[PDB]
Design a protein around this ligand. Structure first.
Ligand SMILES: *[C@@H]1O[C@H](CO)[C@@H](O[C@@H]2O[C@H](CO)[C@@H](O)[C@H](O)[C@H]2NC(C)=O)[C@H](O)[C@H]1NC(C)=O
Ligand SMILES: *[C@@H]1O[C@H](CO)[C@@H](O)[C@H](O)[C@H]1NC(C)=O
Ligand SMILES: *[C@@H]1O[C@H](CO)[C@@H](O)[C@H](O)[C@H]1NC(C)=O
Lengths: 50, 54
């Protein structure tokens, strides 16, 4: 296991998807809110739909 | 451009993500993007220009 800061890890995944790293760091706050909001949404969808 | 920045405490180097092969920071192995204020965690350092001695 190799430690690495999580925002840095995102740049790896972003770089591995075809977008440059800068698009993450210049939008780190926005992406974090989207990730948290999406994580919240899935919990509700699981709870609501039986 | 590829790899990540690392620092041994004093200097700063860029090396590939899967093998410690540090080298000096140069405009060829990095790319500029925007201004310093937007990105968080950025640190002060100089970037050597390969054509500067020329
Ligand atoms: C970090 O690495 C740099 C690479 O330059 C080291 O600086 C060199 O250190 C050696 C001894 O290890 C000296 O003989 C050289 O003159 C230094 N060169 C330069 C350009 O500074 C630095 O010592 C390292 N720092 C550590 C290991 O804490
Ligand atoms: C977390 O990261 C920020 C941004 O680099 C830094 O200012 C802060 O000191 C870090 N917290 C630690 C290392 O505990
Ligand atoms: C250099 O140092 C400070 C503290 O590291 C940093 O916030 C600043 O943006 C850098 N540049 C200048 C011109 O102060």
């Amino acid at each position: 296991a190799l430690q690495i800061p999580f925002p840095m890890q995102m740049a790896y995944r972003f770089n591995g998807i075809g977008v440059t790293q800068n698009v993450l760091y210049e939008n780190q706050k926005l992406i974090a809110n989207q990730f948290n909001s999406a994580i919240g949404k899935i919990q509700d969808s699981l709870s609501s739909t039986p | 451009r590829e790899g990540v920045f690392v620092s041994n405490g004093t200097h700063w180097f860029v090396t590939q993500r899967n093998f410690y092969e540090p080298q000096i920071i140069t405009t060829d192995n990095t790319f500029v993007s925007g201004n310093c204020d937007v990105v968080i965690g950025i640190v002060n350092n100089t970037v050597y220009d390969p054509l500067q001695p020329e």
